[PDB]
């Protein structure tokens, strides 16, 4: 981008478990379903923490 890249974060305030691309302002959770799956869990896309898969 150069000379910063002003963006509008997707999540509200406590966006600890998020990252945002400093060019396009595209948001992604820091914790992905890939990681949950590697731990035999699934991602709760709201809080982006790993919960029970389907048990």
UniProtKB/Swiss-Prot annotation:
Tissue expression, as annotated, is: Higher expression in pituitary tumors than the pituitary gland.
Q: What induces it?
A: By hypoxia. Regulated by growth factors, cytokines, gonadotropins, nitric oxide, hypoglycemia and oncogenic mutations.
Q: What disorder does this protein's entry note?
A: Microvascular complications of diabetes 1: Pathological conditions that develop in numerous tissues and organs as a consequence of diabetes mellitus. They include diabetic retinopathy, diabetic nephropathy leading to end-stage renal disease, and diabetic neuropathy. Diabetic retinopathy remains the major cause of new-onset blindness among diabetic adults. It is characterized by vascular permeability and increased tissue ischemia and angiogenesis.
Family membership noted in the UniProt record: Belongs to the PDGF/VEGF growth factor family.
Mind telling me what this protein is named?
Answer: Vascular endothelial growth factor A, long form
Source species: Homo sapiens
List the gene name. Answer: VEGFA
């Amino acid at each position: 981008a150069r000379q910063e890249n002003p963006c509008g974060p997707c999540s509200e305030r406590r966006k600890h478990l998020f990252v945002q691309d400093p060019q396009t302002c595209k948001c992604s959770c820091k914790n992905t379903d890939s990681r949950c799956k590697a731990r035999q869990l699934e991602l709760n896309e709201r809080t982006c923490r790993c919960d029970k898969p389907r048990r």
